[PDB]
Amino acid sequence: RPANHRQLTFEEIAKSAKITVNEVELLVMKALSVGLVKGSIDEVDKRVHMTWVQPRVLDLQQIKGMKDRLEFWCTDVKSMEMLVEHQAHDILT
Amino acid sequence: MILDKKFHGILDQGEGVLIIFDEPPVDKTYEAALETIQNMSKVVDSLYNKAKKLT
Amino acid sequence: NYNKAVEEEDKMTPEQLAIKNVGKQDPKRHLEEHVDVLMTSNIVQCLAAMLDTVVFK
Amino acid sequence: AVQKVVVHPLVLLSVVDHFNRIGKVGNQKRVVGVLLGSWQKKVLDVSNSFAVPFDEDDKDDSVWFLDHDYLENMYGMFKKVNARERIVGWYHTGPKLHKNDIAINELMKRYCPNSVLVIIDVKPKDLGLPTEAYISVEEVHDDGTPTSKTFEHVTSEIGAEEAEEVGVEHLLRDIKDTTVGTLSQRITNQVHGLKGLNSKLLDIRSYLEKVATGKLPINHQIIYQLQDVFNLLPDVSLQEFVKAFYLKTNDQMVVVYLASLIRSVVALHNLINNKIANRDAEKKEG
Amino acid sequence: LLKLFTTMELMRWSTLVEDYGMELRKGSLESPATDVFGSTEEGEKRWKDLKNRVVEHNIRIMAKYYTRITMKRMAQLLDLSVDESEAFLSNLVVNKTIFAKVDRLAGIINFQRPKDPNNLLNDWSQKLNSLMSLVNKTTHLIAKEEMIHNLQ
Amino acid sequence: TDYAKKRGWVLGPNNYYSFASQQQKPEDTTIPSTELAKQVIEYARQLEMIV
Amino acid sequence: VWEDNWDDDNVEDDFSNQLRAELEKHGYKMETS
Amino acid sequence: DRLQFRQPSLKRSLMPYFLLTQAVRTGNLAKFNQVLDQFGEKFQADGTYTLIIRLRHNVIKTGVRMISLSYSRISLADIAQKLQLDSPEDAEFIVAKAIRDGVIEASINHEKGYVQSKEMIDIYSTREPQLAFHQRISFCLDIHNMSVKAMRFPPKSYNKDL
Amino acid sequence: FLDTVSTFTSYELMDYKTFVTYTVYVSMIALERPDLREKVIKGAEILEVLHSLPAVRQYLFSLYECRYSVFFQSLAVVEQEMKKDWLFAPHYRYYVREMRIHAYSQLLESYRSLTLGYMAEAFGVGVEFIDQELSRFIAAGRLHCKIDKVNEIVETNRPDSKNWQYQETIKKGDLLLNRVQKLSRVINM
C-alpha cells in the first residue's frame, strides 16, 4: 500500500508472523538493527509506521501503478502549467 | 519566579500540568508595531497638510 | 530597520515641508529605495504560489 | 574523484565553428574534437580546444579515424604558446551514444589520462543544459556483468571568468542580467513548468516504451531506486505542515503590511504635490 | 564484544550469568577473575555499576531510534522495579536527558516530538527530502537515458 | 410518524440520536493553495498592469 | 480623558444602586461566607 | 451616559430617568418593575406610555443581548436563576436562535437533567488560520490595492495639464 | 516622582509625608512588579520612609508577596482613607477596580487553571462573590479568554501571545483603513 493510510498496527505483523505481542518490539528492533529500514514511529497506541524501503526483486503492480500515478502526476503538472501560464502569459508575458 | 519571567513555565492547581513554551520571533511584532505607530503620524500629518491647504 | 531608519527623518520632513515648500536641498529621493525594498519583499508573494504548486502537485 | 566541472562557452562556439566551416558537403557527422583543460586542480576548467580530422563509415560503426601527429603538433605548439593548459579528453557532437565510443575513448585512455566525455546536440533545440560531463571510469556491477567502460554523469556549469561575460553581453545586447524583482522572477515562474514539462514528458514516453518493449538489460536495478524516489512522497496529508502554512502566511501578512504602509508613505509626495503644484500653477498661471 | 559493539539488542542478562560464572570457573584464560573480585566492595561496584552501565548504555543506543519503545512495558519485560528505573533517570539528569518529554497521567516517555520550529526542522527535512529527490531524480533519469542508447 | 418520514433519522431505545454533527473532514490544503496561487496571479496582474 | 469615563461610569454608575463600596462588608462576610 | 457635557440642566432634567436608565443594564424584572411605577411621573406621563410599555418587555431582550455579549453557554441554575427565568425551553430556544446567527457557537447536553456544555469558545488562533483570515487577506489586499490605484490615478490627474 | 530624593518638607502645598502618602497609590497601583522592583524596591527612598507608618510596609510586602488574607482584612483602611480628600476622593473608584483587576491579572497571570478551593482559601471570600466578579471582569474588564466551569475549576487558555502578538496591529490596520478611505475622500474634493 503506497498511499491511503500507510499507517498500520502490530495485528498484521503478529498475525502474519504468528508471534506474540511481547516479541514485536525485538522484531522491529532487529528490523532497525539490520539497517534496511529507518522507521521511527511516534505512536501512543500500538501502531506500525515504516519508511523508505526497496523491493530489490520485482513489482508488476507497482509498474502499472507507476504508469498510472506517473501519468497522473504528469498531467497534473501540465494542467497547472497550462492553467497558470494560460492567462499569466497573456497578462504578464 | 514565573511572575519574574526568568524562565519559561507555568504552574497548575487543579490538574498540576506543567507546560513550557516560548515565542522566538520577538523582533517582528516590535518593528511592525513601530512602523504602524510611526506611519500613523505620517498619515495624520498628511491630513493636516491637506486639511490646511484646502480649508 | 532601514525603513524605520528613514522614517525617523520622515517624521521631521513635514516640518520643513510645512515651512518652506520652495526648492529641494536633500539629493535623496526617499521613494525609489523604498520601492526597491518592496521589490525585494515581493519575493515572498511570488514564491508563495511556487510553494502552493510544490505542495499541491 | 571529480565532483563538478567548469565548461566555458568558447568550446561550444568552436562547435558552432565546426558547423560553420562545413562547406555544404552533406555529411555533418559526429565531428570529434580534442577537449583541453586543467586537470591539475580537483575542479575541471575548459579554456579552449581544437579539432582533429574524424571520419566514420556508413554501414560499419566500428570505423574510427584519429591522428597522433596532428595531436602532438597542436598540443606541442599550443603548449609552447600556453603551458598552463594540457590535454584532458575529447568530445563529440553526436546526440546518440554509439558503441564505437569505447574504442575512440580507449586511445585517449591508453596514451592520455582519464578522459571526460561530453554529449551535445547538433541542433540548438534542446531546452536543457547541452553539456554533460561523462567520466570514463570502470565500475563493478552487482548482477555479474563483465567490467566495462561506464559513463557516469558529472554535474557541469557554464561560467566565464573575466572577459567572456563582457564579450557575450556586448554581442547579445538583448539578454538581461539577474535583475531581482518582478519580471525576472515571474518569467521563471511561468516558463519553468514547460522547462520541466518538456524534459519529464519527453523522458517518460521512451521510458514507458522501453519498460514493456525493452530488451538487452539496461540495468533494471536503478529503476527500483527510480520508482522508490518517486514513492518517497506518498501524498502527505499536510496535517503537520498546517502550522508552516500559518508561518509562511504570516510572512505574507508582513509583506502586506510593508506594501500598504510603505506605499502609503510614498503617496505623501504625490498626494501633496498634486494639490500644492496644481493650485499654485493655476492661481499663478494668469 | 560484538554484542557491546553496536546495535545492542534487548536481551536477558541471565544468559550472561552462567557466562560470568564459567568465566570465574575456567582457568585456561582470563584466570584472575578472583583477583578482579579480590576486594569485597570494589568487585560489587564493578558488577552493579557494570550491569548499570549496560542497562543505561542500551538506553543511550535506543535513544537514537524514535520507535517509542514504551519503557513502561520494557520494565515489565525486564522484570525489574520502577524505583531503580527512576534512579536510572536520576542518572539521566546528569547524563544530559534535557531532550525528552514526559507525561503526568501515563508513564510513557517521549525522546522526540519537540516544539518543531517550521523554519529549522521541517525546513531542513524538506530540504534534504525535496532536494535529494531533485538531484537524485536528476542522476538516474539522464543516466538511464544514456544507458538505453547502447541498444542502437 | 410524520417526522420519521420527513426528517429520516434513527430511533433508538426511547431516545433521539443525532448523526452528521461536526463530522465534516477539513480540507487537504490543496484547493486553497491553488486559489492562493490564482490570487497571486491577480496580484501580479493588478499590482503590475499599467507598469 | 473622556475615554476612561465610559468604564468608570459603567462600574461606578452600575454600583450606584446597591453594593457601592462593598469593601467594608467583606470583613463581615469572611466569617459568614 | 453624560460624559463630555458639563451643564446644570441635563443633570436635573435626567435625575428621574437616571436610576432607571442605569437600571436597564442589569435588567431586573420584579424589582425595577415596581421601581418604575413607584416614583414614575414624567417619563411615564409623557403620553400613551408606548415606548416605556414596550421597554417593560424590552428589558428581557436587552438582558439576553447582554448575555450575547456575555458568556455564550447557558446553565440551568446559576444564570437561569440569575436572569429570573427558570425554563429550559425558551433558554435552549433563544440560545439556538443565537447559534443559527453564525457569530458564535454553542452546544447542548443532557446527562442527569442539568444542561452541560464544553464552552470551548477558543478563537481561531492555531485552528484553521488560513481559512480563518484568508478572506481577510484577500479583502484587505483588494481595498489596499484599489487604494494603490487611488494613489496612482491622482498623479495622472496632476501631470494631465503639464 | 523619580526625583523625590531632592524633595524636602514644603509647607506651601503638601508636606513630605503627604506627598509620599499621595504617590504611594499611583506608584503602588499604576506600576507592575518589575517597575516596582526597578524603581522603588531598588531605591532606598521607600526603604527609608517605610519606618514612618508601618501600614505602608504591610500594603507593599502584602501586595508584592501576594497575601490577600491580610490585604482584604486591612484594605478597609485604604478604602476609608482613600476618600474624604480634596483632590484624591472623586477618583477613588478607579483605584479600587484597577487594583482588583491588577491583582487578578497578577495572580491569574502565572496560574493557568485554578480550583475554587485554593482560590477561596487564598482570597478568604465566598465563591458566590468571585463568580460574579469574574463574570463581570471577563466581559467588562476583558482580562483573559473564556473561563471554564465544567468541574467548578477556573481554567483559562489565554492565546494572547502567539497569534494575538501579531494581531495587535489589526486595530491600526482597520483604523488606518478608514483613514486611507478618508484619504480617498480627500481626492478631487
Instruction: Give the phi and the psi of residue A6 in degrees, each rounded to 5.
Output: -55, -30
C-alpha cell at E108: 510513557
> Alpha-carbon distance G5 to F42, whole Å?
47
E137 vs D134, D153, D229: nearest CB:
D229
Among H121, H23, H28, smallest CA distance to H71 is for H121
Looking up cell 492661481, which residue turns up?
D283
The Cα-based distances of I89 to E67, H92, H113, H123 in angstroms read: 68, 46, 51, 40
Measured between CA atoms, the residue of chain H closest to residue G11 is H22
- Confirm or reject contact between E73 and chain A (CB < 8 A): yes
I160 close to H122: Cβ distance less than 8 angstroms: no
Question: Are D277 and H155 inside 8 Å of each other by CB?
Answer: no
C-alpha cell at D207: 521510458
C-alpha cell at G18: 446597591
Looking up cell 566492595, which residue turns up?
E41
Residues 118-157 of I with CB under 8 A from B: 118, 151, 153, 155
D271 close to I183: Cβ distance less than 8 angstroms: yes
> Alpha-carbon distance A24 to A16, whole Å?
12
C-alpha cell at E34: 578472583
Give the gyration radius of chain G's Cα atoms.
13
Measured between CA atoms, the residue of chain F closest to residue D185 is F44
Sheet with strand D149-158: strands edge to edge: D44-46, D4-7, D149-158, D133-138, D116-118
Number of Cβ atoms within 10 Å of the Cβ of A9: 14
User: Chain C residues with CB inside 8 Å of F34's CB?
Assistant: 52, 56
Looking up cell 480634596, which residue turns up?
I86
A74 vs D186, D194, D204: nearest CB:
D204
Measured between CA atoms, the residue of chain C closest to residue D237 is C55
The Cα-based distances of A76 to B11, D201, E49, F19, F28 in angstroms read: 51, 12, 62, 36, 16
Q: Where are the beta strands (DSSP E) in chain I?
A: 113-115, 153-155
> Alpha-carbon distance E129 to E131, whole Å?
6
> Alpha-carbon distance E42 to E40, whole Å?
6
Among I47, I4, I48, smallest CA distance to I26 is for I4
> Alpha-carbon distance E152 to D139, whole Å?
22
Instruction: Give the phi and the psi of residue D196 in degrees, each rounded to 5.
Output: -95, -25
G8 close to I96: Cβ distance less than 8 angstroms: no
C-alpha cell at E140: 538516474
The Cα-based distances of B39 to C31, H136, H157 in angstroms read: 15, 21, 25
- Confirm or reject contact between H87 and chain D (CB < 8 A): no
Instruction: Give the phi and the psi of residue C27 in degrees, each rounded to 5.
Output: -70, -10
D272 close to B46: Cβ distance less than 8 angstroms: yes
Among H125, B9, D107, smallest CA distance to I159 is for H125
- Confirm or reject contact between H145 and chain D (CB < 8 A): no
> Alpha-carbon distance B54 to E78, whole Å?
88
> Alpha-carbon distance E76 to A21, whole Å?
13
The Cα-based distances of A31 to A3, A27, I128 in angstroms read: 22, 6, 62
In chain D, where does DSSP find H-type helix? 9-18, 69-81, 101-110, 164-172, 183-212, 221-230, 242-283
Instruction: Give the phi and the psi of residue D236 in degrees, each rounded to 5.
Output: -55, 140
Touching subunits for chain F (3+ Cβ pairs under 8 A): A, C, D, H
Experimental method for this entry? cryo-EM
Find residue I154's DSSP bridge partners: I114
Element holding C53 (H helix, E strand): helix C32-56
Sign of CA dihedral I27, I31, I33, I39: negative
Sign of CA dihedral D223, D229, D230, D234: positive
Chains G, E in contact, 3 or more Cβ pairs below 8 Å: no
Helix/strand/coil for D261: helix
Question: Are D180 and C51 inside 8 Å of each other by CB?
Answer: no
> Alpha-carbon distance H65 to I137, whole Å?
17
Question: Are B22 and E115 inside 8 Å of each other by CB?
Answer: yes
Which residues, 6 or more positions from A84, have their beta carbon under 8 angstroms from its beta carbon?
A: C49, C53, D190, D193, F37, F41
Q: Cα angle vertex C39, ends C38, C42, to 5°?
A: 85
User: Chain H residues with CB inside 8 Å of G1's CB?
Assistant: none
> Alpha-carbon distance I96 to I81, whole Å?
12
In E37-81, where does DSSP find H-type helix? 42-62, 71-77
Number of Cβ atoms within 10 Å of the Cβ of H78: 14
Among H137, B41, I164, smallest CA distance to C10 is for B41
> Alpha-carbon distance E5 to E81, whole Å?
28
- Confirm or reject contact between B26 and chain E (CB < 8 A): no
Helix/strand/coil for D278: helix
If phi > 0 it is left, if psi is from -120 to 50 it is alpha, else beta; for residue H106 that is beta
Find residue D89's DSSP bridge partners: D35
Cα dihedral D92, D93, D96, D98 in deg (nearest 10): -30
C-alpha cell at F21: 454533527
Per-residue b or e along G19-30, where b marks 16 or more CB atoms closer than 10 Å to that residue's CB: eeeebeebeeee
Element holding D135 (H helix, E strand): strand D133-138
C-alpha cell at D101: 565510443
Element holding D136 (H helix, E strand): strand D133-138
> Alpha-carbon distance I87 to E73, whole Å?
72
- Confirm or reject contact between D264 and chain B (CB < 8 A): yes
Amino acid, res. I138? I
Measured between CA atoms, the residue of chain A closest to residue F51 is A92
D250 vs I166, I180, I186: nearest CB:
I166
Number of Cβ atoms within 10 Å of the Cβ of H79: 16
Question: Are B42 and C3 inside 8 Å of each other by CB?
Answer: no
Strands D49-51 and D32-37: antiparallel
